[PDB]
Design an enzyme around this catalytic site. Sequence first.
Site, short mmCIF file in Angstrom:
data_model
loop_
_atom_site.label_atom_id
_atom_site.label_comp_id
_atom_site.label_asym_id
_atom_site.label_seq_id
_atom_site.Cartn_x
_atom_site.Cartn_y
_atom_site.Cartn_z
N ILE A 77 0.76 -1.10 -0.12
CA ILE A 77 0.16 0.06 0.11
C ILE A 77 0.88 1.23 0.11
O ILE A 77 0.20 2.51 -0.08
CB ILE A 77 -1.10 0.01 1.14
CG1 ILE A 77 -0.27 -0.20 2.49
CG2 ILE A 77 -2.02 -1.05 0.80
CD1 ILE A 77 -1.35 0.05 3.68
N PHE A 126 -6.15 -1.62 10.17
CA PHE A 126 -6.32 -1.08 8.79
C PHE A 126 -7.30 0.00 8.69
O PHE A 126 -8.36 -0.24 8.83
CB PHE A 126 -6.29 -2.36 7.94
CG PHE A 126 -6.29 -1.90 6.31
CD1 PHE A 126 -5.25 -1.59 5.70
CD2 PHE A 126 -7.53 -1.71 5.74
CE1 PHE A 126 -5.18 -1.31 4.33
CE2 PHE A 126 -7.54 -1.49 4.30
CZ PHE A 126 -6.70 -1.12 3.65
N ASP A 134 5.85 13.84 13.35
CA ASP A 134 6.04 14.00 11.76
C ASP A 134 4.52 13.69 11.08
O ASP A 134 4.48 12.99 10.19
CB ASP A 134 6.65 12.95 11.44
CG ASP A 134 6.96 13.17 9.64
OD1 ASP A 134 7.00 14.20 9.13
OD2 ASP A 134 7.29 12.08 9.16
N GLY A 138 10.33 1.61 6.12
CA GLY A 138 10.03 0.41 5.07
C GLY A 138 8.60 0.38 4.54
O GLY A 138 7.90 1.36 4.40
N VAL A 139 8.47 -0.57 3.67
CA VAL A 139 7.43 -0.89 3.06
C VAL A 139 6.04 -1.07 3.76
O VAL A 139 6.23 -1.78 4.97
CB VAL A 139 7.41 -2.07 2.01
CG1 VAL A 139 7.79 -3.31 2.65
CG2 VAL A 139 6.20 -2.14 1.01
N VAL A 140 5.05 -0.82 3.56
CA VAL A 140 3.87 -1.03 4.20
C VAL A 140 2.86 -1.94 3.45
O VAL A 140 2.79 -1.59 2.14
CB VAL A 140 2.95 0.45 4.48
CG1 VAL A 140 1.84 0.24 5.44
CG2 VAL A 140 4.01 1.46 5.18
N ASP A 150 1.26 6.22 12.59
CA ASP A 150 2.76 6.27 13.06
C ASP A 150 2.96 7.12 14.16
O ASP A 150 4.21 7.63 14.27
CB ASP A 150 3.47 6.49 11.74
CG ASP A 150 3.13 5.49 10.67
OD1 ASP A 150 2.80 4.58 10.95
OD2 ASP A 150 4.02 5.89 9.47
N1 LIG Z 1 1.86 2.42 8.63
C1 LIG Z 1 0.97 2.13 9.17
S1 LIG Z 1 -0.35 1.65 9.90
C2 LIG Z 1 -1.68 1.90 8.63
C3 LIG Z 1 -3.05 1.54 8.38
N2 LIG Z 1 -3.49 1.73 7.44
N3 LIG Z 1 -2.60 2.63 6.87
C4 LIG Z 1 -2.63 3.23 5.48
N4 LIG Z 1 -4.08 3.25 4.98
C5 LIG Z 1 -4.69 3.91 3.77
C6 LIG Z 1 -4.46 3.36 2.59
C7 LIG Z 1 -3.51 3.99 1.80
C8 LIG Z 1 -3.23 3.22 0.43
N5 LIG Z 1 -3.61 2.26 0.29
C9 LIG Z 1 -4.65 1.48 1.15
C10 LIG Z 1 -4.82 2.01 2.11
C11 LIG Z 1 -1.67 3.93 5.01
C12 LIG Z 1 -0.42 3.80 5.90
C13 LIG Z 1 0.53 4.73 5.18
C14 LIG Z 1 1.22 4.29 4.09
C15 LIG Z 1 2.19 5.08 3.50
C16 LIG Z 1 2.82 6.01 4.42
C17 LIG Z 1 2.45 6.54 5.71
CL1 LIG Z 1 3.07 7.81 6.37
C18 LIG Z 1 1.29 5.70 6.00
CL2 LIG Z 1 0.71 6.17 7.48
N6 LIG Z 1 -0.49 3.34 6.97
C19 LIG Z 1 -1.33 2.68 7.42
#
Ligand SMILES: N#CSc1cnn2c(NCc3ccncc3)cc(-c3cccc(Cl)c3Cl)nc12
EC number: 2.7.11.22
Length: 290
Positions: free
Chosen positions: A10, A74, A119, A16-18, A137
Amino acid sequence: MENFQKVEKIGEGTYGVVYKARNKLTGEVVALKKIVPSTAIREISLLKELNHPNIVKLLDVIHTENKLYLVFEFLHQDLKKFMDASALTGIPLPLIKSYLFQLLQGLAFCHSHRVLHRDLKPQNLLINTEGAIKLADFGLARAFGVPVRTYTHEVVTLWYRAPEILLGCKYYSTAVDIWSLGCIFAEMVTRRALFPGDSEIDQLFRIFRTLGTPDEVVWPGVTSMPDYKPSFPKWARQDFSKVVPPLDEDGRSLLSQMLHYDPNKRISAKAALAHPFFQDVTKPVPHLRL
Ligand SMILES: N#CSc1cnn2c(NCc3ccncc3)cc(-c3cccc(Cl)c3Cl)nc12
């Protein structure tokens, strides 16, 4: 990790990767963040207890083969995507107000436990179909630090960074999050980033051009900060009426307090919740297309 099935990547976070993943057991759908120094382990472990409805829940911590995986609740969308999607008409004020209120509630909670985010940015503000918004985060910065570039070399945004950080203050506090949230509030209203700096000096100068170059009058002690230079150009302060039209007087008053230069004078999350701007706060349902 064998307990999870990766559904899809995502994004690429700072550390790292999420991934969106499924617990091969409970069937639970979660966000899996791939990130160890005992210092980090203990700090992250404390975050598991820092629970609040406006903070993305940290479900578990997995340390294996000297690798670290954080399992979180999520959420389907973030504020950045939502704002991009609402670009044509803008987010309705009542929804902006609800989001700001909830975010301040999350901040008030974390700050009460002396935990800073450090941040905040639209990318880590997550929303659901129920009209909720949550901080993601939270606490990872103190746990792993904030790099200039992500693991993918992507530039970490400076747009929401408080001036005291930019000026070299080593022991900044909770006020840094209020600044960030003020920047985000302005961005939701105007549909444009408030201070989109592309370097530390450009960030600082963008802030100065709008709020005026800080001096000892508005921020006692500023001229003594590590990175302060007497040679900074001296710009005059702009009226907020010109900065965030057409936000109303209540909103502008609140924004002005969240953007005070002196961190000690900057409004706290708790006091912000009592501001007249929230007298008529409600909780609208956003229209999400998932
Ligand atoms: N980490 C964690 S827990 C986390 C739980 N949901 N989530 C989402 N969900 C929104 C989403 C975006 C794209 N596709 C599907 C759902 C984004 C990120 C995240 C992804 C990238 C950068 C940053 Cl700063 C974050 Cl906060 N972290 C998280």
